[PDB]
């Protein structure tokens, strides 16, 4: 996260760390959406241009974390993957369209002050909250700058950006399965996700029920916190049917 702040303890209890077994390293961010399902970005698990194609056995899920590098004894819980599900039309070849995957845990994790699921938006929350100007929040253990590693979970509030501004900011073809967030160069304030923040949650606090919803997944950006550039997030609601379907069918 660039230009963010340290997370408060318990501020993001849905925050998950995708961790590589060997060599032990952070691979990505992710979110807890129930006691057995973790939401992440497709490209965290599969991205042939970088020779990335992770299998279940390659990974651990670390839930409840604060520190980036520490084993947080009695606090974090490390989970094993039973199954990973990538969107069948995840477009890794061109623009990361539909950049979303589910990970089923082997055993359920136990909720706690530090471990708790985020909601997934319904059409009405999406419609009400996914508006230009409305701010969401993004968290991750990724890089502090484009060119670095944070000691604790980083947090940044970023305004959703107008779709045409999004489109005019890049040569990449953007889709309805994406939205962009970030300040405009003259809004002064800045901040963005960066490398290692991938698959982490863009969340918003609904003012109607006071509940945190995950509207986005950290998906892609060109550089990090570059002026006139915006972070791109997987539009979670738009892919919700796939989410429910995968969860309903496989449990």
């Amino acid at each position: 996260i660039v230009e963010g702040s340290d997370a408060e303890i318990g501020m993001s209890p849905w925050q998950v760390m995708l961790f590589r077994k060997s060599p032990q390293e952070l691979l990505c961010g992710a979110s807890l959406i129930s006691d057995r399902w973790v939401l992440t970005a497709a490209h965290c698990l599969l991205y042939p241009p970088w020779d990335k194609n992770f299998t279940e056995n390659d990974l651990l899920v670390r839930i409840g974390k604060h520190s980036r590098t520490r084993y947080e004894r009695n606090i974090e819980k490390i989970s094993m993957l039973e199954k990973i599900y990538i969107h069948p039309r995840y477009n890794w070849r061109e623009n990361l369209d539909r950049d979303i995957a589910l990970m089923k845990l082997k055993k359920p994790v136990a909720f706690s002050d530090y471990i708790h699921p985020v909601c997934l938006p319904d059409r009405e929350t999406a419609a009400s909250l996914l508006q230009a100007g409305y701010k969401g929040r993004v968290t991750g253990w990724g890089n502090l700058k484009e060119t670095g590693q944070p000691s604790v979970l980083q947090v940044v509030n970023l305004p959703i950006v107008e779709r045409p501004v999004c489109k005019d900011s890049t040569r990449i073809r953007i889709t309805d399965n994406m939205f962009c967030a970030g300040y405009k160069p003259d809004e002064g304030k800045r901040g963005d996700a960066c490398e290692g923040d991938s698959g982490g949650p863009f969340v918003m606090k609904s003012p109607f029920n006071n509940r945190w919803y995950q509207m986005g997944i950290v998906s892609w950006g060109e550089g990090c916190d570059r002026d006139g550039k915006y972070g791109f997030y997987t539009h979670v609601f738009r892919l919700k049917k796939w989410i429910q379907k995968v969860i309903d069918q496989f449990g």
């Binding site: 961790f19 077994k21 060599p23 032990q24 390293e25 651990l60 590098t69 084993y71 590693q149």
Partner: peptide, 11 residues
């Protein structure tokens, strides 16, 4: 590798 060792159990 700058990560503290996790219990060997987790794998």
């Amino acid at each position: 590798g700058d990560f503290e060792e996790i219990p060997e159990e987790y794998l």
